[PDB]
Every structure is written in structure tokens, then in C-alpha cells.
Design a protein around this nucleic acid. Structure first.
Ligand SMILES: Nc1nc(=O)n([C@H]2CS[C@@H](COP(=O)(O)OP(=O)(O)OP(=O)(O)O)O2)cc1F
Ligand SMILES: [Mg+2]
Lengths: 553, 399
DNA sequence: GTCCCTGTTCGGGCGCCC
DNA sequence: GGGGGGCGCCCGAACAGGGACTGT
């Protein structure tokens, strides 16, 4: 039937008007699909025949459902969507099985024909005019929420929430995970009393016009829910079938990364760096891309991972939340969250590269941050951490990074590869290290530049560069000095730019040149990098400025 | 009957996404809100209201009392638009939370939709629950304004009787300054609180707030590196103090020398360094506070629980430069310390200029947003932006 | 002023759910 | 085959903002 719930007042964006769009042509199979649906809906007052007093129209179609026996009537409302007001979406995320607590009794219910059970605002109904092509063609409008309209999900989700409020306040200790029209219902009653509470919920929903067909009323484990199978003590993801082509387009790559991402929530060790690099630049989905040797190999490892059997467990709040992170290389991380060892709640990965230049301690801090926020969403609290980084390492980094950085409660885990700082600038100038004054100049017109140094022991070198920039020459000069210096070196630069990068101790960079520089910094015993104001006559910055300036500036 | 209020012309309402909340904070928010709903102060709304403002909750001090906090910064920036110089000079100032007062006033019906907010659920068990205000919401800049007339009538008697007590209001806050011994003061405040109970953050001491001067090293031996570091620091300071000179000191760096070579200071450079030492201790010239401009606060991590900051409205025109010391311990938490620092600074700013600064925070955006509400204790919230500070400026302000 | 470099946001694909 | 909202993931196109540069 149709809920006696009050409609939600909607309106078009100011100065706009309803869609006028030709019904495009449909399959025979689909026209009879539609007609059967529309004669039934019309009978039930869910749609109304309209006349010529309705200028509007919007194309309709249908697709088979997951049942493959039933059709879903859809409406391409993309134009009405454009001209409809904004809603605030009330769905803030996706519930996750790992966040469920053990319940003695469980039920899963799906509301039947959910949207069509919720009234649409009368004032707005006319913009939903459509036409079934066929005897001639029939013109209807919607009295209930239509599928393809942008207001329908929020309005349904909000209505469902009003409807369950009273049952929730009366039954505070029945837990009801409410996702669209899908209900997970859990309790700590004996199955006898539980079944009775379910009936009371079902009657409650039926009083507000929402039916719950026995066909989608799961009573025994394992429950199918949100893409999982919930067993009484463990949960599982429904099988993830990877594609298997030999040519790969941008589109089926994007499709493979997605299934992998989805997979990583419970499959430890999933990696997709090498695969998503492929997607760079490529201008269209149809475009084909050849698997790099590394991507090739990565896809294999993932395939082996997916072959194993795996599961998660439910949340026990009387216990601690533990997050364990593992370094994976390439700016790739994996984590398993658990309470009791070797019984994961869930897993995940972190690979986001943010920054032209970064290092592993930064990246680890980003991983911890993401994991924390995710734990707060799922369990409502921060987890305790097990990280592959020595307390001394983190300490060093923290007392020398000029930024506020912090990790919650953690404890070290000898499982390699450990995270570390790969070199360390000196805080004092070095005795018996040669002093390099470096500098660069670039001509903005010609793009020609020079980079070079001058040392206190009387060496000088100038390298000429083409198609370059000021920043680039400053970086080139520092590199040059690292190349021609010993295991210990003092470098004086006038470039804040260059100084800011190196001082943050990167071990990876987008920049070829910065990477070469990093390679050198790791080989050294001691580096000390100092700054002076440029063009302020400070020798021997002065000396090297003259060198690289000549014929450039 | 309500005061009609409108947004600034050509400006729409706030549309800011609610962030994830801890279970503790959510349970508190749901408890507080169902009660506020019982009292008519808020109403459930639907999703046809397109506006949103984030909300969370702070457990003040040692108590078991949560206070709801609505991040109204966006709305305040979009709402339509003298200060007691003596307040900064009292030996004690107490900060009273007079938020509840605002619930006594209805809120213009056509404005209510802009005060929408949404309560999240743990693990998304339910869609968010949306609400709307029917009274003057705390945190909104319109609240103290509209309640101004009524607020004056309340204090008027207490002021007459205590003309040496300065009472100042900012948003949900009442600053009360006295030169009383700390005993008669606290008795005075409790008097004023009795006086407020009748008609429906301690303790400050602005008389010991500190200016942090730029300072120059003192040494017996100077190396090339020392002098280089000095010359660069003075170069920069000479943008704040035109009087700074560098010629003689820079003379010692003629040639191209080892960083660790010792360089004896000439007589000239010796003197020009002494002069500079004093030029640094003077009022910076031509610094006029302009109420129409925002206060910019800038903070640098100095390490070891040491944080420096400056407040200016235009570059090198510092209205105040200060320091903030904390525990040099093991359980140091930078983010906590940093949010305690922004709260001290905002506080000084309200007390000195009656305004909130805009902060340039030396923290990663994501790091900050993950944790700052775990350490927040104010009823207001300053604007801010994030900034990877040049590690140069870190050196300029060091002590 | 201009050019360079870096960081943010935001929109567009795909994954998953109903 | 064509629709919607949510969250996730990646990418690159706009921007914003600060430092360095020019100059008969
Ligand atoms: N692909 C989908 N698009 C949608 O707009 N939905 C929306 C509109 S109907 C609602 C519930 O999904 P569901 O498969 O239960 O559709 P119902 O109309 O309730 O059909 P049933 O009678 O439960 O078979 O979610 C679902 C989809 F799978
Ligand atoms: Mg259904």
C-alpha cells in the first residue's frame, strides 16, 4: 500500500520549470514489463493518468532485478534533477559488519516496493509526467517516490527514520541497522521472544504502509546483508570475481581497482599502486593500456591473495581495539584491526600519495590518521596501534619536524620492513667538512640557466642547463655539490625553496632531480645545510652568484 | 515577537558536512538534543532543508557535563553584520558561560532553516538525524546582538553597584574583570552568578600577559656560520624595524670561508650589533589596530613545548608577539598543545581587541581535523587555515 | 606586475549497497 | 544499453598563495 506519512515539501530551483523530454523508444519486452507495472500501480493509486494540461514528460525504462524475475521501473530524470532544489543528504556512510556486536537473535527484512510506498508532494507531482508507449500510448504522473529522481533517496531515508523512531524509543534494546529499506534486526532475547518483537516491528511498519514480504525475511544464518554473509560468530564478503582479459582498457582497469579496493576490507595485503599508475594521462575509458611488467606482477599477487579463504569477527566492546600497520613499499600500507590476535575485525590499505616530496614517517602518520577516523566511524573510538617504527625513530622525527605531528597510543612491532629516516641533516656545521656555496640562475625568456658552487678550498664548478627554472637550478646546484663533495659536506644555499624540501627529509619524490639528491643524502655521513639571504653581498655566496649569473642575468 | 534577520546580500546558507563523532560525544549530543527538543528549543527537520552546520560536544574540565557546540563559523561569516580597553588591565578576569540565556528568545522564523545540523550514528546504524533552532542558538553571532538590549537590563543593577568591575560580552561569553584580591573577586563573581540565576573557564590575569621580543645571541666566539645566521636574522628583522643595520657584520664575511672558522668581531661590527640589540627593543612604529580587518595569528613550533606566535593585520606590523610554554615531557602531544595555544591566543585577542583572530596553523590539515575537538574547551571557534611554515621563520622568533 | 611550484577542492570515471 | 543517493578509490583541471625575478 501507500504510507499515511506526510509528504516532504519540495520545489524546483527558482525561475525554472518541469522537464519537456521526448520518450525515447523501448524494447517490446520492456513495454510489456512497464505496462504490467503501470496498470498495477495505477490501480493502487501510486500513479495517475494525466491529460493535455500536463506539458511535461521524462523518458522511462526498465532493467531486470537481481531476482532476474522482476523488473525495475526507472525514470531518466536527469533534467528534472537539474532543476530540482538541493537536499541535505542524511545518509552519512555505509554500515560495516565489523562494527556489529554479537546478538543472540538476528533477523533481516527487506521492505517490499519501498519507494512506491512513500507519497510524493502533491504540488510537485506534475513534473514527474511520463508516457508508456505501446492501442495507443498512456500518460501518467507519480503519486509516490520515483526511481531516478534525486530527491527520492533522502526523502525515503528520512521517512523511514521517522517511521522507526517510535518503535526505537519503545524498544531501545532492539538494534535496527537501517539501510534504505533494508533492516538488520538484532536482540539478546531467546529466539521465541525475538520472533515476537519482529512481528511487532513488522506490524509497526505495516501500520505506516510498509510491507515486509516473507520472501525477503531471513530467519536463519547465514544472513545476506549489505554484500556480506553474517554467520553467528563470523562474517564474510560475498565472492569477489576478478575480470581476466588479456587486453585491458582504462574502464576494466578502473573496474579491477574497484573490486580490489572493495576486497581489501577483509583480504590483507591487497595492492593497487602499479595498477592505478596505468590510469595516468589516459584520455578515455575505451582507451586500451598494456600491463606494465610491475602491474602485471602486482595483479598476480592479488590474485593469489583472493584465492585464500577469509573472514572477520564481530565487535566486543568490553575489549580493546588494536590496529596493526605493515609497510608495503611504494607508499603502500596495509592494516589489520583486531581485538584478539589472528581474529581480524577488518583490514584495509592506505596508498594515497600527497606531496611532491615525502617520506615514510609522514606516510605512516597519514595512515594512522585515516585509520583513526575510520575507527571512529565504525566503532566510535580510536584503536590502540602496533606500528613498525621504533620509538626512537619517531622521537627524532618529532623533535626536528617544524610542524605539529602526533600519533595516538602505540607500541612498536619488529615485523619488517621497519619505517625509518634514511638520513639526517646536522644541526651544527661540520668541522673538517669542506664548505660549498651553491647557487643557480635562470633566464625566464630563453629558459637557459647555470648552476654551480664555490668552495672554501678554492674549487669552483659551473654547469649549464637548458629548459630550466630558478628553483630547478637551485636544486641542481645542491646536487652538484653533493656529487663533488666527500662523505661530509657543509652546503650554504640562498634558496628557501630548496632548503624547505631537503630539511623535511624526503626519501621519495615526484621529481627525478630530488630523487637523485636524496640518493646522495643517503650515501653521506654528515650533511649540514645552511641558508643565507641572496644578493646581500655575503661571500662566498657573493662569489658563486657572480659565476652562475654571468650570461644569464 | 522576533527580530527579523537576513543573510549578507548575495550569500546563501551554510552547507558544511558533519564530521565523524565519538560514541561518547554522540550519546551526549542525543541526550542533550532530545531534551532541547522537549523544551521547544529545537525541532526535527527533513532533507528538503538544504543547509547544514557541523556539531559536536565538549566535556568541560573534570565534570560529567557535556556542552553542545555548533560550528557556526560559516553561518556567522554569512549573517548580516565600543570595546573596554580597561578589561586587559584588571588583575583578575573570570569567564562566565552565559549561553543558556539565548534560549529564552525566539528566533526569526525565516532564519531558522540556516541553523540546521545533523547528528551521526555509530557505524551508520541510521541515517543522520536533522534539527533546526527555534530560539537563539549559542555560537551564533546574531545571538549576543539580539539579546544585547535584554543583557544590559540584567547587568545594569550589578554594574551601578560595582563600577570598578568591568563586564564584557563576546558571543556565549561574559568576561568580568576586577582588581579585587582573589577572594573578594571570586565572591563577587558568585554574586553576579546569583544575580543571573534570578533572571533566567576561570581564571584570567591580563596583567601578566607577556610580549616576546626578538633577541640576538650573545657569544664570546663567533664563527662564520654564527655570523651568517645572525646576518640573515637581522636582514629579516629589518623589515619589522627599519633601524636594523647589517653592513659591518656582513663585512666579516668577505671572501669565501669555512663555516666553522672563528671570526673576531671588529670594533664597528661590535657596536652595530649592540645598537641592533636595542633597536630590537622598541615599539614597532605605525601599528594601528583596524577593526574592519581580520586579526591574523601565526604560530610556530619552537620545540620542547615552546610555541611562538604573532598577531598582525598587515605583514611586519605586529600588534603583539608572544610565547607559550608547556611541559617538556614524555607524554607531549603537539596537537593538544597547539589547540591549547590557539585557545590562549584567541582569548587574549577577545580580551584585547574584542575580536577573534584568523589562525595560520603549522599542522597538516588532516592531522588537525582528526584530533582538535578532543582538546577544545571554548564556546567559540576561530577561523583558521593550514600552512607549512618556512623553517626560516621558525628561527627568527626562537628564544 | 610574471612565472614557478605546491597544495586544495572538486568533478569525473570505476567499486560496493539499496 | 540509458536513472538516483550514499561511502570508498584514483586521477587531473581549476584554483589559491607565496617566493624570485626586472631594470636602456
Ligand atoms: N539500483 C537501485 N536503484 C534504486 O533507486 N533503488 C532504490 C529504489 S527501491 C529501493 C529498495 O531497493 P529494492 O531492490 O528493495 O526495491 P523494492 O522497490 O523495495 O523491491 P522489492 O519489492 O523489495 O523486490 O532502493 C534500489 C536499487 F537497487
Ligand atoms: Mg525492497
Amino acid at each position: 500500500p501507500i504510507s499515511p506519512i506526510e509528504t516532504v515539501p519540495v520545489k524546483l530551483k527558482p525561475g525554472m520549470d518541469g522537464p519537456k523530454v521526448k520518450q525515447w523508444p523501448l524494447t517490446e519486452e520492456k513495454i510489456k514489463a512497464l505496462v504490467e507495472i503501470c496498470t498495477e500501480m495505477e490501480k493502487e493509486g501510486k500513479i495517475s493518468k494525466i491529460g493535455p494540461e500536463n506539458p511535461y514528460n521524462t523518458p522511462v525504462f526498465a532493467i531486470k532485478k537481481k531476482d532476474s524475475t522482476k523488473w525495475r521501473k526507472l525514470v531518466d530524470f536527469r533534467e528534472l534533477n537539474k532543476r530540482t532544489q538541493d537536499f541535505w543528504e542524511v545518509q552519512l556512510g555505509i554500515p560495516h559488519p565489523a562494527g556489529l556486536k554479537k546478538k543472540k537473535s538476528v533477523t533481516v527484512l527487506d521492505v517490499g516496493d519501498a519507494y512506491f510506498s512513500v507519497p510524493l508532494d502533491e504540488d510537485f507531482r506534475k513534473y514527474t509526467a511520463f508516457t508508456i508507449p505501446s492501442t495507443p500510448g498512456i500518460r501518467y504522473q507519480y503519486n509516490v517516490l520515483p526511481q531516478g529522481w534525486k530527491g527520492s533517496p533522502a526523502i525515503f531515508q528520512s521517512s523511514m527514520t521517522k517511521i522507526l523512531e517510535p518503535f526505537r524509543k519503545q524498544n531501545p534494546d532492539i538494534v535496527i541497522y537501517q539501510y534504505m529499506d533494508d533492516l538488520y534486526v538484532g536482540s539478546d532475547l531467546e529466539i521465541g521472544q525475538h520472533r515476537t518483537k519482529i512481528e511487532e516491528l513488522r506490524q509497526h511498519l505495516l501500520r505506516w504502509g510498509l510491507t515486509t514480504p516473507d520472501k525477503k525475511h531471513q530467519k536463519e544464518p547465514p544472513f545476506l546483508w549489505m554484500g556480506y554473509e553474517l554467520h553467528p560468530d563470523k562474517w564474510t564478503v560475498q565472492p569477489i570475481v576478478l575480470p581476466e582479459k588479456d587486453s585491458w582498457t582504462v574502464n576494466d582497469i578502473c573496474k579491477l581497482v574497484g573490486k580490489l579496493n572493495w576486497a581489501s576490507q577483509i583480504y590483507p595485503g591487497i595492492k593497487v599502486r602499479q595498477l592505478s599508475k596505468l590510469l595516468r594521462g589516459t584520455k578515455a575509458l575505451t582507451e586500451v593500456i598494456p600491463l606494465t611488467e610491475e602491474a602485471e606482477l602486482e595483479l598476480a599477487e592479488n590474485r593469489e591473495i583472493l584465492k585464500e579463504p577469509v573472514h572477520g569477527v564481530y565487535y566486543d566492546p568490553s575489549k580493546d581495539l588494536i590496529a596493526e600497520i605493515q609497510k608495503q613499499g611504494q607508499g603502500q600500507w596495509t592494516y589489520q584491526i583486531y581485538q584478539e590476535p589472528f581474529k581480524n575485525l577488518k583490514t584495509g590499505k592506505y596508498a594515497r600519495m600527497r606531496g611532491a616530496h615525502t617520506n615514510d614517517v609522514k606516510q605512516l602518520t597519514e595512515a594512522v590518521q585515516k585509520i583513526t577516523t575510520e575507527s571512529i566511524v565504525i566503532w566510535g573510538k580510536t584503536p590502540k596501534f602496533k606500528l613498525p617504527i621504533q620509538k626512537e625513530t619517531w622521537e627524532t622525527w618529532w623533535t626536528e619536524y617544524w610542524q605539529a605531528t602526533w600519533i595516538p597510543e602505540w607500541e612498536f612491532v619488529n615485523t619488517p620492513p621497519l619505517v625509518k629516516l634514511w638520513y639526517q641533516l646536522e644541526k651544527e656545521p661540520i668541522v673538517g667538512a669542506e664548505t660549498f656555496y651553491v647557487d643557480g640562475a635562470a633566464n625566464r625568456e630563453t629558459k637557459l640557466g647555470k648552476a654551480g658552487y664555490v668552495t672554501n678550498r678554492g674549487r669552483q664548478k659551473v654547469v649549464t642547463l637548458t629548459d630550466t627554472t630558478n628553483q630547478k637550478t637551485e636544486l641542481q646546484a645542491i646536487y652538484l655539490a653533493l656529487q663533488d663533495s666527500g662523505l661530509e659536506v657543509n652546503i650554504v644555499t640562498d634558496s628557501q625553496y630548496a632548503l624547505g624540501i631537503i630539511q623535511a627529509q624526503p626519501d621519495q619524490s615526484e621529481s627525478e632531480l630530488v630523487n637523485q639528491i636524496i640518493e646522495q643524502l643517503i650515501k653521506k655521513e654528515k650533511v649540514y645545510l645552511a641558508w643565507v639571504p641572496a644578493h646581500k653581498g655575503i661571500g662566498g655566496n657573493e662569489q658563486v652568484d657572480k659565476l652562475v649569473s654571468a650570461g644569464i642575468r | 515577537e522576533t527580530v527579523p534577520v537576513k543573510l549578507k546580500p548575495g550569500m546563501d546558507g551554510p552547507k558544511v558536512k558533519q564530521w565523524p563523532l565519538t560514541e561518547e560525544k554522540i550519546k551526549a549530543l542525543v541526550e542533550i538534543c532530545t531534551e532541547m527538543e522537549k523544551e521547544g528549543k529545537i525541532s526535527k527537520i527533513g532533507p528538503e532543508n538544504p543547509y547544514n552546520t557541523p556539531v559536536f560536544a565538549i566535556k568541560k574540565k573534570d565534570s560529567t557535563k557535556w556542552r553542545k557546540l555548533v560550528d557556526f563559523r560559516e553561518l556567522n561569516k554569512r549573517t548580516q553584520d565600543p570595546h573596554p580597553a580597561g578589561l586587559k588591565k584588571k588583575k583578575s578576569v573570570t569567564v562566565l558561560d552565559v549561553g543558556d540565556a539565548y534560549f529564552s528568545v525566539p528566533l526569526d522564523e525565516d532564519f531558522r532553516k540556516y541553523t540546521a545540523f545533523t547528528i551521526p550514528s555509530i557505524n551508520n546504524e541510521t541515517p543522520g538525524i536533522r534539527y533546526q533552532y527555534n530560539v537563539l542558538p549559542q555560537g551564533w553571532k546574531g545571538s549576543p546582538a539580539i539579546f544585547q538590549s535584554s543583557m544590559t537590563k540584567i547587568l545594569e543593577p550589578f554594574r551601578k553597584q560595582n563600577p570598578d568591575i568591568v563586564i564584557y560580552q563576546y558571543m556565549d561569553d561574559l568576561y568580568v574583570g576586577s582588581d579585587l584580591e582573589i577572594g573578594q573577586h571570586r565572591t563577587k563573581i558568585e554574586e553576579l552568578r546569583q544575580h543571573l540565576l534570578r533572571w533566567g573557564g576561570y581564571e584570567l590575569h591580563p596583567d601578566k600577559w607577556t610580549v616576546q621580543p626578538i633577541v640576538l645571541p650573545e657569544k664570546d666566539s663567533w664563527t662564520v656560520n654564527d655570523i651568517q645566521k645572525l646576518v640573515g636574522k637581522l636582514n629579516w628583522a629589518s623589515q619589522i624595524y627599519p633601524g636594523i643595520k647589517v653592513r659591518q657584520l656582513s663585512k666579516l664575511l668577505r671572501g669565501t670561508k669555512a663555516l666553522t672558522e672563528v671570526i673576531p668581531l671588529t670594533e664597528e661590527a661590535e657596536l652595530e650589533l649592540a645598537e641592533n640589540r636595542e633597536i630590537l627593543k622598541e615599539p614597532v612604529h605605525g601599528v594601528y589596530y583596524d577593526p574592519s580587518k581580520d586579526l591574523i595569528a601565526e604560530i610556530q613550533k619552537q620545540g620542547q613545548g615552546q610555541w611562538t606566535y604573532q598577531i598582525y593585520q598587515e605583514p611586519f606590523k605586529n600588534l603583539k608577539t608572544g610565547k607559550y610554554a608547556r611541559m617538556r615531557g614524555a607524554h607531549t602531544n603537539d596537537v593538544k598543545q597547539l589547540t591549547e595555544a590557539v585557545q590562549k591566543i584567541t582569548t587574549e585577542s577577545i580580551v584585547i581587541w574584542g575580536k577573534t583572530p584568523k589562525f595560520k596553523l603549522p599542522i597538516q590539515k588532516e592531522t588537525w581535523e582528526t584530533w582538535w575537538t578532543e582538546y577544545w574547551q571554548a564556546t567559540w571557534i576561530p577561523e583558521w587555515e593550514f600552512v607549512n611554515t618556512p623553517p626560516l621563520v621558525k628561527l627568527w622568533y626562537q628564544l
